């Protein structure tokens, strides 16, 4: 079980670690988070108490280095940093644990929520969507735009999600206009799966990462990408049975985890009504249809 120590907490802030969150007071004796499960990506996220403007945070994998948080009073944010001195890092963590200055990652033994949300998410794939090659961890915030949003401005600070556009030459074979527009199977199976993602696991990893950035940061371009990747599958007449079954599980846990009070801003009425009731796959998402009907029957 790994540790992300904090140098200090000089400004009042709500701290998130994955699906959990904790309020920390201005200059509270807080020195970080311990007992973080090895085997998963994680996200450590922030919303300042004095300025709920910019939610921001860091994706990381404790298997890939020793990470800590330190407030930067020039840039006015909590920064992730890597400690390359293993023995220095081990001594820091030991002292903070001995003085019980750390919160414990509060995982219930029965609870597979985080695995179910991150099953296909890989830190190496995150670092290709969020390009900052000198760090092993990835910064995301509320306002970062996608490559697709920037086509329709600073490219170094963009979310490089795979561009999906139903009315693009990429989506539509010359001579199969009606076929390819009404049945997206070509675009899903040949262009995206065989062509760009190589396999369903990579496609689901991007879908899951887009959901998590939409939920944890209120990132609008991430929410657009999550819905586009769901709609591309639901709008395809020919999808492998294993991919439909896995999508139903993925979406079930995403709808389960969404705070009830954010449903209005995080869920697209047209896409969900189309996916559940009109599309080729309207009968293929039993678990997702049941949780959506019981939790968000207004949206539908």
């Amino acid at each position: 079980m790994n540790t992300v120590p904090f140098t200090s907490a000089p400004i009042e802030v709500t701290i998130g670690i994955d699906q959990y969150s904790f309020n920390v007071k201005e200059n509270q004796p807080f020195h970080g988070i311990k007992d973080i499960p090895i085997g998963h990506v994680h996200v450590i996220h922030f919303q300042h108490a004095d300025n709920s403007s910019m939610r921001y945070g860091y994706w990381f994998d404790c298997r890939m280095g020793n990470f800590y948080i330190q407030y930067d009073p020039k840039d006015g944010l909590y920064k992730m940093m890597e400690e390359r001195d293993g023995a220095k890092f081990e001594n820091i963590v030991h002292n903070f644990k001995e003085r019980q200055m750390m919160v414990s990652y509060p995982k219930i033994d029965e609870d597979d929520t985080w695995y179910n949300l991150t099953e296909f998410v890989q830190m190496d794939k995150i670092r290709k969507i969020v390009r900052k090659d000198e760090n092993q961890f990835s910064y995301v915030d509320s306002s970062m735009t996608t490559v697709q949003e920037n086509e329709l401005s600073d490219p170094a600070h963009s979310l490089n999600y795979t561009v999906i556009n139903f009315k693009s030459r990429e989506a539509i074979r010359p001579g199969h206009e009606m076929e390819d527009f009404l049945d997206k199977s070509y675009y899903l199976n040949t262009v995206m799966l065989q062509g760009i993602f190589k396999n369903s696991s990579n496609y689901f990893g991007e879908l899951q990462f887009a959901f998590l950035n939409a939920m944890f940061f209120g990132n609008y371009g991430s929410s657009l990408q999550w819905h586009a990747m769901i709609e591309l599958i639901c709008s395809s007449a020919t999808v492998p049975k294993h991919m439909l079954d896995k999508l139903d599980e993925i979406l079930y846990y995403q709808i389960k985890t969404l705070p009830e009070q954010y449903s209005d801003i995080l869920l697209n009425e047209r896409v969900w009504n189309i996916c559940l009731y009109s599309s080729f796959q309207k009968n293929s998402l039993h678990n997702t249809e049941k949780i959506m009907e019981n939790k968000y029957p207004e949206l539908l």
Partner: protein, 237 residues
């Protein structure tokens, strides 16, 4: 975006544009079967593609053979329309290609956008105008070429005859839409008004009668009266 009463002069500017009306593409008669079920029988249709500035009409005849063994024909008809408009654009020299295509029905927007992805600089637009182009099949010479067709065919017409020798495009479009609105509202009465006087004939190379300027003013008056007469008949007003 959308074409309306505000931006109406735009129809007659020097940017090449075409109206596309798909109303008469898929045409059927509904009839009883021997078992007392209902079945359709398709008849020949047409795409109505019109340059409002020049009067040039690209009448693409849709022969019933293009429906044989196809399903969901009202959906296919929109895509076949888009396919044939795209083929027409690609057939025209670059300097003749439209800058804008206006569809009379919003259901044509996605099919036409998808068929025209190769032409990103041709704007595909809807219109808020209620245009009477469904009545094109009330023009005897257009109805005749459509029903006689034994195979797919494109026929070229000038829907303004020689009017642009004497009047502006704006006025020619006004006259055409009034005539088509009257034919749509009361076909029998409209044709009676146009063909009442045997001394005024249709030239072999024309669609409409050879009215002098003063006779067109009388015809236009009689067409407006018909539309008002029919409005009173419909609403008991």
């Amino acid at each position: 975006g959308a074409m309306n009463s505000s931006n109406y002069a735009e129809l007659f500017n020097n940017d090449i544009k075409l109206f596309v009306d798909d109303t008469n593409v898929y045409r059927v008669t509904v009839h009883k079967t021997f078992e007392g079920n209902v079945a359709t029988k398709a008849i020949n249709g047409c795409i109505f593609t019109l340059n409002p500035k020049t009067g040039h009409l690209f009448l693409k005849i849709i022969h019933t053979s293009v429906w044989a063994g196809q399903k969901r024909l009202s959906q296919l008809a929109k895509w076949k329309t888009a396919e044939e408009v795209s083929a027409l654009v690609r057939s025209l020299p670059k300097e003749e290609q439209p800058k804008q295509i206006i569809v009379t029905r919003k259901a044509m927007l996605d099919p036409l956008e998808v068929h025209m992805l190769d032409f990103p600089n041709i704007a595909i637009r809807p219109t808020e105008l209620r245009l009477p182009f469904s009545a094109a099949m009330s023009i005897d010479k257009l109805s005749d070429v459509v029903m006689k067709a034994t195979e797919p065919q494109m026929v070229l017409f000038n829907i303004y005859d020689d009017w642009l020798d004497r009047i502006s495009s704006y006025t020619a479009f006004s006259r055409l839409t009034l005539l088509l609105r009257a034919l749509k509202t009361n076909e029998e009465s409209a044709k009676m008004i146009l063909l009442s006087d045997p001394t005024i004939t249709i030239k072999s190379y024309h669609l409409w009668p050879s009215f002098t300027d003063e006779q067109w003013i009388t015809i236009e008056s009689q067409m407006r009266d018909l539309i008002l007469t029919e409005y009173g008949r419909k609403y008991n007003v």
